[PDB]
Design a protein around this ligand. Structure first.
Ligand SMILES: [Zn+2]
Ligand SMILES: [Zn+2]
Length: 205
DNA sequence: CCTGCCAGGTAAGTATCTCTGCCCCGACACAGCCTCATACGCCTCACTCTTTACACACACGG
């Protein structure tokens, strides 16, 4: 919406980089997920027409745009001049943008999201007209779902590397069999493996 | 212990090239401008058969 106040679009974009509980569980089969990446690294920014808009809300945030400026001032590699804003006071229709032209949304540091604007049209009925649900993700890709590699009847809850039983190196196991190729009879490691929690983005967001 | 003329056979002759040193050279670098010509390279696009996933359907059989 043209008054939706960015940091509202930001808080609503359903990516899976706002998931993926970190940490390696190689000796902890049953571990409480302490913090999803959404909670930990709340910093993010929108790049729009030279200017940056940094999510300065949530003072556990930081300035991800800063880094870029650091090498646009020294050793100019294209891109000339740059600017930065706060993204919190700024709402939509406060910008000076092009349509159909790629712009950036970087959240969680390295996930990059292109923010092409398809078209600006005035409000008209035959739509919701609501405000609560208004960001309104109306299309999504229906991605593929990574299933377990031992059995094919469940999804990939666990990703293991350097395993001692996995044919492939990054091997995706459902929780059932993951508990059965490792962690035997007391929940103690078998062989060697680095097991990380997998979110299976075909399922989420 | 040598020495030689004649017949027969043969034969002419005419008629109808591969190195090898060696002086007197072209083409290398490389300088700016400059215009158009040629080559390379790299990522974005296409597509195409062949699976790949996934909601749904439909007998099937006793
Ligand atoms: Zn993301
Ligand atoms: Zn399994």
């Amino acid at each position: 919406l043209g008054s939706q106040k960015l940091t509202q679009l930001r808080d609503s974009i359903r990516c899976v980089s706002d998931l993926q509980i970190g940490g390696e569980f190689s000796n902890t089969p049953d571990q409480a997920p302490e913090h999803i990446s959404k909670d930990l690294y709340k910093s993010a920014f929108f790049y729009f027409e030279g200017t940056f808009y940094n999510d300065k809300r949530y003072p556990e945030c930081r300035d991800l745009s800063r880094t870029i400026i650091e090498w646009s001032e020294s050793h100019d590699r294209g891109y000339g001049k740059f600017q930065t804003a706060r993204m919190e006071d700024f709402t939509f229709n406060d910008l000076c943008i092009k349509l159909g032209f790629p712009y950036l949304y970087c959240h969680q540091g390295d996930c990059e999201h292109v923010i092409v604007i398809t078209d600006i049209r005035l409000v008209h009925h035959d739509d919701c007209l609501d405000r609560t649900l208004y960001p309104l993700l109306i299309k999504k890709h229906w991605l593929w779902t990574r299933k377990c590699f031992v059995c094919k009847m469940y999804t990939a809850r666990w990703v293991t590397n350097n395993d001692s039983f996995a044919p492939e190196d990054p091997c995706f196991f459902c929780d059932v069999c993951f508990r059965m190729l490792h962690y035997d009879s007391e929940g103690n490691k078998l062989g060697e493996f680095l097991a990380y929690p997998y979110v299976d983005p075909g399922t989420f967001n």
